[PDB]
Structure 1
Amino acid sequence: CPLMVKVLDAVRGSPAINVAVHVFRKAADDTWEPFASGKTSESGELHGLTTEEEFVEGIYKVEIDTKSYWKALGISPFHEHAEVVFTANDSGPRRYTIAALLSPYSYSTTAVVTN
């Protein structure tokens, strides 16, 4: 897994389960082309989005559907989604972990980049 997404719920103190995640890659014509998508598991993790071969150099956008997550719990949140945009693999292949913590009116995201 060159790209992994982990999402936590700050209100329930739990993994954020069944959270839709969409990954895009900036095309040559500056458009966002769909790259991969999935949903977080029971552990709040999303594995197997892509492969080392497919995950080339580029600018990527990870869009976490936080709104749908909070709605399903009967909460009307502030954000439409949580976005993470980053240039990947510019100095060679790396392993990326995108961690997100969710509150109805707040979110934080951090990146763990290893070799």
Structure 2
Amino acid sequence: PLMVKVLDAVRGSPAINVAVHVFRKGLTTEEEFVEGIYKVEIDTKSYWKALGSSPFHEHAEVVFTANDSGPRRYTIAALLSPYSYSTTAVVTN
């Protein structure tokens, strides 16, 4: 008899992230999974994923150049950071 209690009585003003998972019983194969319940991808890159069956098989002259550059600013305050009775400020003068 599964019997799960999470955050039953709450009095006040909290700041909560709740993730409750209850369970009971080709190139990429995925089966019966849970992914990225609270997932953050800010600057994620991916080149040439799962190209396929028999690419560039017989003859190929490939020039792969990946120039990642340039002025990029990522200013984040309280990433996945619940708060209460606090002061969060981003000041970019």
TM range (shorter): under 0.3
Unaligned runs of 5+ in 2: none
TM-score, length-normalised on structure 2? Answer: 0.14
Is the contact made by 1:99 and 1:110 (CA closer than 8 Å) also made in structure 2?
yes
Moved more, 62-71 or 101-110: 62-71
Partner Cα separation in structure 2 for residue 81 and residue 107 of structure 1: 64
**Alignment partners' CA distance in 2, 1:14 and 1:89:** 48
Q: TM-score, normalised by structure 1?
A: 0.12
Distance 1:80 1:12 in 2: 69
Size of the aligned set, in residue pairs, is 92
How far apart are 1:23 and its partner, in Å?
Answer: 1.9
Measured after TM superposition, the shift of residue 5 of structure 1 is: 0.8
Distance (whole Å) between structure 1 residues aligned to residue 30 and residue 58 of structure 2: 30
Change (3 A) 1:81 1:89: same
Taking only aligned residues, the RMSD between alpha carbons, in angstroms, comes to 22.3
Q: Would the alpha carbon gap of residues 52 and 65 (structure 1) be closer, same or farther in structure 2, given more than 3 Å must change?
A: same
Q: Which has the larger radius of gyration?
A: 2
The 1:21–1:57 alpha-carbon spacing in structure 2 relative to 1, beyond 3 Å, is closer
Deviation at 1:24, TM superposition (A): 2.8
Greater RCO, 1 or 2 (C-alpha within 8 Å, sep 6+)? 2
Runs of 4+ in 1 over 3 A off after TM superposition: 9-21, 48-115
Q: Which runs of 5+ in 1 are unaligned?
A: 26-47
Bigger proportion of residues as strand: 2
